[PDB]
């Protein structure tokens, strides 16, 4: 009956935790001892992208590690040449209420989504000189919080309808829909092999999903408040989260639990974006205290701040070659830190 | 210079995009952003039907001031994760049905929504245009059913003028910042036209009281 099902869910969660704590042979923070710390390293800004006129909510790097895309509330999807601070494109969005943007791994396509519950896919390399919508991916019953291009034809979107969904650009329909996530999903991060993806929601739980199978493979809990951002380790077997609970937690896929809590007593603001540097030795976390804290991802200490923003940092991401990290913020400014 | 014949024109493209973005941002800065809120089925659509799925953005022009109102009540998500998008709105057009004081109570749910948005950290310094509408149903409901059948804390009688003004004073009393922001309360019905004038007249007071605060004048 109903009593057994609640008891079964309670005993299964206890059974998951019983096996989870048994595998905790040694914490990663204790394991990473007698190692050389990264140290206080200053990463001064190199280029300041100064085109946006409203709060920037998302940015993404091209796989060439030079092209950049960014979305703000002035109804603009600016494409940056980060090397020379040049505007490659500026796309007028029909709905200025966007909370995410994405760059295709190929580079031909750029996505954006937000409060209009629609993922708009923009074709950059058209025969015409303008940037036009390929297919608007309507079908979500909540705000679109994050989106990431799988291929030129596949993109999985994290929405405010408490569900994630993998789409298909050719047909415009969700090939699979990822359900079972109580509370609305606020961010997602595709794997380097583009096979699995995790997603952070307002249940303070990060769930790993199989893209093809459509099944929630694993659940990661431990955050006290809602998760605003997530990011895979470059290896693809681990990921770090960013939550309003004011700590970043590194979850391992195989270990199926936490590794560290990147928490400081002097910091109470909630993380808005999280990005792993190449080799995963540095974690770039975009905090809400007008600053990004560069966390040495293998230790519990901080590798330094970069600051340089007059408002809350809302988006940041390192390049695909690790050359630089761009940190957008609500002050309509993008700074390339290196 | 050390600029190629194509890097010179790539810079020219960037310079010419900035001229388009400045022109787009100067046009977007003259559009008044209003965040429409209030409980569902509380006369919200009434104060939109006089002029001109997630956000139902509504644009209406009044006295050479381009407005832009965001009917956001269709989100049905955790509002704490997308209400920060509406920083810098001129006012919050809150719509509360007066007749919904007894239909578990809509007024208590609507009063709780006013608490959650007047005391919000993102809206600590923006005004609220409270719209106590559907007085026509409120008039017939007060005469047929006294307010003491649902509200025993009321001291006044079951009249109209003192009962309606009681809800006005019971809704501008939850502002934890009585001086940083001002609730501009209006009374409207279905057969009314001055509601759009009240929104234009209120935001002019919002703009000026921000303009005076800009150049240290008030």
């Amino acid at each position, epitope marked *: 009956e109903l009593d057994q099902l609640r008891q079964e869910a309670e005993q299964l969660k206890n059974q998951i935790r019983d096996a989870r704590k048994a595998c905790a042979d040694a914490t990663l923070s204790q394991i990473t001892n007698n190692i050389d710390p990264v140290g206080r390293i200053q990463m001064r800004t190199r280029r300041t992208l100064r085109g946006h006129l409203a709060k920037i909510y998302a940015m993404h790097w091209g796989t*060439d590690s*030079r*092209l950049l895309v960014s979305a703000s509330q002035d109804g603009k999807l600016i494409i940056w*040449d980060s*090397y*020379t601070t*040049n505007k*490659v*494109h500026a796309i007028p969005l029909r709905s200025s209420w966007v909370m995410t943007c994405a760059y295709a791994p190929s*580079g031909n396509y750029v996505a954006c989504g937000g409060l209009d519950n629609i993922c708009s896919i923009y074709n950059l*390399k058209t*025969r*015409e*000189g*303008n940037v036009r919508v390929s297919r608007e991916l309507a079908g979500h019953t909540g705000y679109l919080s994050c989106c990431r291009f799988l291929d030129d034809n596949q993109i999985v979107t994290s929405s405010g309808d408490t569900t994630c969904a993998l789409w298909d650009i050719e047909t415009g329909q969700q090939t699979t829909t990822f359900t079972g996530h109580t509370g609305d999903v606020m961010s997602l991060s595709l794997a380097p092999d583009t096979r699995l993806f995790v997603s952070g929601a307002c249940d303070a739980s990060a769930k790993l999903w199989d893209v093809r199978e459509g099944m929630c493979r694993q659940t990661f809990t431990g955050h006290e408040s809602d998760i605003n951002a997530i990011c895979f380790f470059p290896n693809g077997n681990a990921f770090a989260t960013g939550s309003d609970d004011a700590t970043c937690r590194l979850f391992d896929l195989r270990a199926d639990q936490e590794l560290m809590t990147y928490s400081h007593d002097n910091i109470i603001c909630g993380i808005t974006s999280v990005s792993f540097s190449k080799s995963g030795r540095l974690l770039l976390a975009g905090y809400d205290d007008f600053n990004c804290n560069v966390w040495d991802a293998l230790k519990a200490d901080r590798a330094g701040v970069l600051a340089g923003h007059d408002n809350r940092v809302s988006c940041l991401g390192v390049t695909d070659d690790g050359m630089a990290v761009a940190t957008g913020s609500w002050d309509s400014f993008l700074k390339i830190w290196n | 210079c*050390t600029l*190629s*014949a*194509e*890097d*010179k*024109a*790539a810079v*020219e*493209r960037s310079k*010419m995009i900035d001229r388009n973005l400045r022109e787009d941002g100067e046009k977007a800065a003259r559009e008044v952003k209003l965040l429409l809120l209030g409980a569902g089925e509380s006369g919200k659509s009434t104060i939109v039907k006089q002029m001109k799925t997630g956000i139902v953005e509504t644009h209406f022009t009044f006295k050479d001031l381009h407005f832009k109102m965001f009917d956001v009540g269709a989100q049905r998500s955790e509002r704490k994760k997308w209400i920060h998008c509406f920083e810098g709105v001129a006012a919050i057009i809150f719509c509360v049905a007066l007749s919904d004081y007894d239909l578990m109570n809509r007024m208590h749910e609507s009063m709780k929504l006013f608490d959650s948005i007047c005391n919000n950290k993102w809206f600590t310094d923006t005004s609220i245009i409270l719209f106590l509408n559907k007085k026509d149903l409120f008039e017939e409901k007060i005469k047929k059913s006294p307010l003491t059948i649902c509200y025993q804390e009321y001291a006044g009688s079951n009249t109209y003028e003192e009962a309606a003004a009681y809800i006005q004073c019971q809704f501008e009393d939850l502002n934890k910042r009585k001086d940083t922001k001002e609730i501009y309360t209006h009374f409207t019905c279905s057969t009314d036209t001055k509601n759009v004038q009240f929104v234009f007249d209120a935001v002019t007071d919002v703009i000026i009281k921000n303009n005076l605060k800009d150049c240290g004048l008030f």
Partner: single-chain antibody
Amino acid sequence: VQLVESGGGLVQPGGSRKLSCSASGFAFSSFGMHWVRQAPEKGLEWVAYISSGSGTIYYADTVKGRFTISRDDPKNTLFLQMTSLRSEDTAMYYCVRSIYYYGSSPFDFWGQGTTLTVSSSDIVMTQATSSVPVTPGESVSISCRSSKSLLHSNGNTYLYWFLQRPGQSPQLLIYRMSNLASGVPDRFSGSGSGTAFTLTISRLEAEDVGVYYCMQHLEYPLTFGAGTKLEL
């Protein structure tokens, strides 16, 4: 995507003739337009370049001053006004579009151009190969010679490879050292380094034959190579 160039014809010496291009099918207002001439017996020769929004305007040193260029962004129309048409202006003036951003492919689409007839510092681009005979299905690697290195400090080598098939407007093949254009087969492969430049084809069909033109874009004025006419 088309560029219907209008005007032109038989013009008396010393007169003027307004050349117009009816650009359509694309976002013309963000395209830096060009003009490329071609004598009936000689090779291509660049004429002018008006950037987007009627910005920076360049001219060839041969016809600078007496050639004045203009564009009409709302009408999607590109004009070229020239006065005192000498005996050396009996060339076919092609109209080219070109956009400049990172990863862009300038000179990608060329208009069919107009025929003009009259009554009667720079980087040198030379290709000693001409009237090259080759059978289809083989591999041909023609070469183009530059006066100096086209490789820049940023790392972009502004060499361009075109293909004027017999009786048709030129078509871009390789818009950099090796950057293959969009809409052309993968068989084409430009190469070379520094001053020496070459364009290689894996196998050639009966279609990709004609005269191949090499062109620099390092700085203005832009100079084309001579006629490298592939023969079947």
